[PDB]
């Protein structure tokens, strides 16, 4: 099993266990059931309704601001004629060890066999400062880079020597995850937490790797191995821009095992969203109990949860699950305003929880001209472009067309790119800025037909204000607001703080960015939904069998 | 004198000695004068222009991408039938020790003598998880936050006692900098880089006020008393959304001066721009070499810098000033794609630099509600419009229009505004945000004649395209950047590294969004182009006189 490091529990068996017997949960026959708003049709919003359903819940509504279902899960299509061809706006790489997620791919039958082509996985170059570096498939990366590709190696299977008692590799953390050593895990995390709680990413690898005992051995030198590691990064490509993260919120991918054995879903991740909202309940799918209006204030008179429409009309529930952003949940739905939805502190989470920027630009090639020439599949580069990934949607036919992630880009580096929002514009910028260094490689970078407006698709997260930004990564000091956020359904547990409305989204999970974290949310807030209006929880339960007890 | 701490060394007496002995140098019968091609019309570029006129130089021309001059420096009118109204969408409040800016302040006659309205100049609310709490003008802060408070200024006064190796208390340096202490300035500065340039200001303050040494031998608890003293600030109002910043960055500000004495401008500060570009040269205003023209790439050939402009146009200029952003630098103009121009360390420093995210909204209300009737001139507040201020722009007029900054935020405080840009929803919202806590001050918070469109402005200059952001603002560990950038124009002593071109404006000096930067730097390239091209720099020069190394 893979419990998450700061629950301590895995939703993987649990699900398991309630496919067979009747859901999550349910109610005594003749009972009357809630009717319950789900804001937002992204995977929480679908996985919360979905369990509901299935849970006996007959009214639910989910309520979608966009004129598509999905959220920040979005394979886009060039052409609907050649509908293999994607591009992954949103949600791209998937790990195994997210046992929420894959119990939902496994169970739809999307194929997660594949490897994603991450750096090091496949011939990859990075580029810096002017120079192209090569890094070969499956191989260690160049030996420029290889001090500070040891020193993390070395910390995470080695741990770090603090003189006032060391701290455990996080491979071992990782270890007793798995066997089931949870008070081992607990204690040995809360070690972390007690040392880098406040530390950015910047700030902790610069105590670890220039100390008195650096792992790998060698000093870093400041700032040149510094750079060099934020070009290199950790398994996802260059992390330069998430430097001021907490540390923290790295540890714990890793530990997770986020950063391991990531998965491409050729079909496209909207798959898991289309066969969600396939499914059919009391002779209905779950797409037609999707209602397309956008979601304002929300209020409460007496037990009771009023939702106002876009329309101007105005439905109440008995129960809502919001799934919106806390950028959403503050100013749209009101939500931070008194104390008549979440407590102070819950709303000091939601007020100051830091949401990513992050921006995509995606071209189809007439071809999939890396293969046949002397090409690398992913460059990592301290340019403009940042992240390129060259995507196969068809490896049986090596002469079928191209899809080119020729920007992949978090923070300031996506900031950059909101000047220049024409995506023509803005792709030869691009093309131009890998030109400088790769002459050879971005002469292929052409649409097909030399087409820009059918052949690029381009989307910036942090002014989509359906998103208002990309994923939630916390600062150092903010763990916290992870904590409340992801234990405010459990109010459900508690009868004189239900107040009838639980958050949900990734945005409010321990897992800010992954998909695992909608669908642990989204378990959670259904959890409390069945519990608040007296129905019964299968054993297993999020609500009754997560304990974690750490401090952030 | 106030000589500056990273380069000790004060802009005012040389300014001064220079202006009645013909400007900063000059030619040679028997020199040619080159003719110079300046990137940006905001106060950066029209001070080098006029520094380099005074001097002698007859061919200068300014390139301008916006609508007018000025730049970040933007004293918009809401009604031009009512004109003495207006909204300070850029600078605002200016420090007497920024004698850089202030010579030019003096020069033209734009009054500095009234006080901005900060916090605890005037009388404040602080609104903090739905309370209110009042300050009244020129006392000490609330109860509540007093703790902290007094923290802050116990570590102004004592500095930090570590075991390391005690750091000098700010004060005093300040004291050695003003006393021409400047050795003696230098070690204690060089003490708190080595400490903190790694660090955060969240990060600093933790370890300083949590650990065994806190500043008033009182310990802050964690996270409440952080939680405060973001709410609280330090001269400025909540700095919160600035704690991922460098804290070497907050000290300077606070060494320098900065956050001392702040003054108005009633005429706006815009004033500053029209008086700069008004002056006559050689028969011509300043204002008419300003050309109307977004520049785009700026390439080598031969000797010469060729200027290429939005119509397909182009010019051949012996020297080029370049004003306009790091992200401009290196997207527009395309400078950082090779060595023809920058250093590789130059042009990381470039691509990497931080800039933040800022915006304001401004209504001017009939009248000066906050005069008359009990109620604060600056409100503070943990909610959704974070700094809220009132403007007298008629003191002796009593019954005049009042101006309300209504909402002043910074980075993710500013970032959230980005969803509703329309003017009426984004001030209802934040007249709303404000009357959960206020609502006798927000009955007050109407547009005159009820019109949102005419007597509300506001501006984001994150996705303003101009600008690519509010101002520069080092994370930590990128203090060399500042560094970088601001010796850049020294290549000039260098002709092996010369290459013609320098850079200038605040985002290249070591005060990111103060006008003294973007006045330190205007001079600095100024005398570079002279230098380069034959001319002597009269003695006190910048070029000859900074010589500070400092190791950030
Ligand atoms: C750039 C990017 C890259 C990512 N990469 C990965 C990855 O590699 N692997 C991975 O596992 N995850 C990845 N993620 C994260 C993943 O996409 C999310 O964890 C996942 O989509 C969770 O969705 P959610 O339901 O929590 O929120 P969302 O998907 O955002 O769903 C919320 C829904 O609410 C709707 N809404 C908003 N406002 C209203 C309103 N007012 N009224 C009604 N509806 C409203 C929105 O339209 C949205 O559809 C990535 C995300 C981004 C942005
Ligand atoms: C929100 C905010 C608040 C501030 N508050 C204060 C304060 O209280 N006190 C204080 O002293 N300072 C303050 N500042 C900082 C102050 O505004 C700056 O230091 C100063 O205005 C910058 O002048 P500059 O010439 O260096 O840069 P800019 O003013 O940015 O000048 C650059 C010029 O180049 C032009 N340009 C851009 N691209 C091109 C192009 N491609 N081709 C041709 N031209 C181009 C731009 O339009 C701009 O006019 C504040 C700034 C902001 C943003
Ligand atoms: N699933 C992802 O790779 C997005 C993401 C989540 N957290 C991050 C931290 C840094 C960079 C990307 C991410
Ligand atoms: N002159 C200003 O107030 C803008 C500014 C410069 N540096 C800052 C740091 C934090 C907040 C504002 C600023």
Same mark, same amino acid.
């Given at each position: 099993?893979?419990?998450?490091?700061?629950? =301590?529990? &895995?939703?993987?068996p #649990?699900?398991?266990?309630?496919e067979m /017997?009747? *859901?999550?949960?349910?109610?005594?026959?003749?009972?009357?059931?809630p009717?319950?708003?789900?804001?937002?049709?992204?995977?929480?919003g679908?996985?919360?309704?979905?369990?509901?359903?299935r849970?006996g819940v007959?009214?639910?509504?989910?309520?979608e601001?966009? &004129?598509?279902?999905?959220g920040?899960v979005?394979?886009?299509?060039?052409?609907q004629?050649?509908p293999?061809?994607?591009?992954?706006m949103?949600?791209?790489?998937?790990?195994?060890?997210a046992?929420?997620?894959?119990?939902?791919?496994?169970?739809? *039958?999307?194929?997660?066999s /594949? /490897?994603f082509?991450?750096?090091?996985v496949?011939?990859?170059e990075?580029h810096?400062?002017?120079?192209?570096? @090569?890094?070969?498939?499956?191989?260690?990366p160049?030996?420029?880079?290889?001090?500070?590709?040891?020193?993390?190696?070395?910390?995470?299977?080695?741990?770090?020597?603090l003189?006032?008692?060391?701290l455990?590799?996080?491979?071992?953390?990782?270890?007793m995850?798995?066997?089931?050593?949870l008070?081992?895990?607990?204690?040995?995390?809360?070690?972390?937490?007690?040392?880098?709680r406040?530390?950015?990413?910047?700030?902790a690898?610069?105590c670890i790797?220039?100390?008195r !005992?650096?792992?790998?051995g060698?000093?870093?030198?400041?700032?040149?191995? #510094?750079?060099?590691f934020?070009?290199?990064?950790?398994?996802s490509?260059?992390?330069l821009?998430v430097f001021?993260? *907490?540390?923290?919120?790295? =540890?714990?991918?890793?530990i997770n095992?986020?950063?391991?054995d990531q998965? +491409?879903?050729?079909?496209?991740?909207?798959?898991?969203?289309?066969?969600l909202?396939?499914?059919?309940?009391?002779?209905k799918?779950?797409?037609?109990?999707?209602?397309?209006?956008?979601?304002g204030?929300?209020?409460?008179?007496a037990?009771?949860?009023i939702?106002?429409?876009?329309?101007?009309?105005?439905?109440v529930?008995?129960?809502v699950?919001?799934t919106?952003?806390?950028?959403?949940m503050?100013?749209?739905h009101?939500?931070?305003?008194?104390?008549? #939805?979440l407590?102070?502190?819950?709303?000091?989470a939601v007020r100051?929880?830091?949401?990513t920027g992050?921006?995509?630009?995606?071209? =189809?090639?007439?071809?999939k001209?890396?293969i046949?020439?002397?090409?690398?599949? %992913?460059?990592?580069?301290?340019? +403009?472009?940042?992240?390129?990934?060259?995507?196969?949607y068809?490896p049986?036919?090596?002469?079928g067309?191209?899809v080119?992630?020729?920007?992949?880009?978090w923070?300031?580096?996506?900031?950059?790119m +909101?000047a220049?929002?024409?995506?023509?514009?803005?792709?030869?910028?691009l093309?131009d800025?890998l030109?400088?260094?790769?002459?050879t490689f971005?002469?292929? +970078?052409?649409?097909?037909?030399?087409?820009y407006?059918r052949?690029?698709?381009? @989307?910036?997260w942090l002014?989509?204000? !359906?998103?208002?930004?990309?994923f939630?990564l916390?600062?150092?000091?903010?763990?916290?607001?992870?904590?409340?956020?992801?234990?405010?359904?459990?109010?459900?547990?508690?009868?004189?703080? &239900?107040?009838?409305?639980y958050?949900?989204?990734?945005?409010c999970?321990?897992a800010?960015?992954?998909?695992?974290?909608?669908?642990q949310?989204?378990?959670?807030?259904?959890?409390?939904?069945?519990?608040? %209006?007296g129905?019964?929880?299968?054993?297993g339960?999020?609500?009754?069998?997560?304990?974690?007890?750490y401090?952030?």
């Open positions: 099993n893979s419990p998450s490091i700061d629950i =301590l529990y &895995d939703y993987g #649990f699900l398991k266990k309630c /017997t009747g *859901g999550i949960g349910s109610y005594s026959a003749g009972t009357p059931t009717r319950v708003a789900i804001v937002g049709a992204g995977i929480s679908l996985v919360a309704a979905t369990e509901l359903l849970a007959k009214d639910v509504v989910l309520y601001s966009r &004129d598509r279902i999905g920040r979005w394979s886009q299509v060039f052409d004629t050649r293999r061809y994607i591009a992954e949103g949600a791209m790489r998937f790990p195994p060890s046992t929420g997620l894959f119990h939902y791919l496994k169970k739809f *039958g999307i194929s997660t /594949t /490897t082509p991450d750096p090091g496949v011939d990859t990075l810096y400062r002017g120079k192209r570096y @090569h890094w070969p498939a499956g191989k260690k160049p030996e420029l880079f290889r001090r500070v590709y040891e020193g993390w190696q070395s910390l995470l299977s080695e741990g770090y020597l003189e006032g008692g060391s455990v590799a996080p491979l071992d953390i990782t270890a995850l798995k066997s089931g050593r008070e081992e895990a607990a204690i040995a995390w809360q070690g972390w937490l007690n040392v880098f406040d530390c950015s990413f910047y700030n690898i610069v790797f220039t100390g !005992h650096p792992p790998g060698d000093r870093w030198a400041r700032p040149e191995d #510094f750079e060099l934020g070009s290199l990064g950790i398994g490509g260059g992390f821009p001021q993260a *907490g540390f923290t919120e790295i =540890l714990r991918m890793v095992g986020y950063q391991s998965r +491409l879903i050729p079909d496209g991740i909207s798959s898991l969203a289309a066969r909202a396939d499914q059919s309940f009391d002779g799918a779950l797409r037609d109990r999707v209602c397309f209006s956008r979601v204030r929300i209020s409460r008179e037990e009771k949860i939702i106002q429409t876009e329309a101007g009309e105005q439905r529930f008995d129960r699950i919001v919106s952003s806390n950028r959403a503050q100013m749209i009101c939500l931070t305003d008194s104390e008549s #939805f407590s102070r502190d819950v709303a000091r100051e929880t830091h949401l992050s921006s995509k630009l995606f071209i =189809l090639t007439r071809t001209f890396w046949k020439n002397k090409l690398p599949t %992913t460059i990592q580069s301290d340019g +403009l472009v940042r992240g390129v990934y060259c995507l196969d068809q049986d036919e090596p002469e067309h191209g080119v992630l020729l920007s992949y880009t923070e300031d580096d996506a900031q950059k +909101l220049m929002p024409d995506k023509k514009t803005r792709c030869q910028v093309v800025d030109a400088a260094i790769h002459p971005a002469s292929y +970078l052409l649409p097909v037909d030399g087409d407006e052949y690029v698709l381009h @989307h910036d002014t989509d204000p !359906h998103s208002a930004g990309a939630k916390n600062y150092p000091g903010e763990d916290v607001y992870s904590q409340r956020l992801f234990f405010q359904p459990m109010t459900a547990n508690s009868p004189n703080k &239900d107040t009838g409305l958050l949900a989204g990734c945005s999970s321990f800010g960015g992954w998909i695992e974290g909608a669908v949310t989204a378990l959670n807030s259904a959890c409390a939904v069945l519990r608040s %209006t129905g019964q929880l299968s054993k339960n999020p609500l009754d069998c997560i304990n974690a007890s401090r952030y």
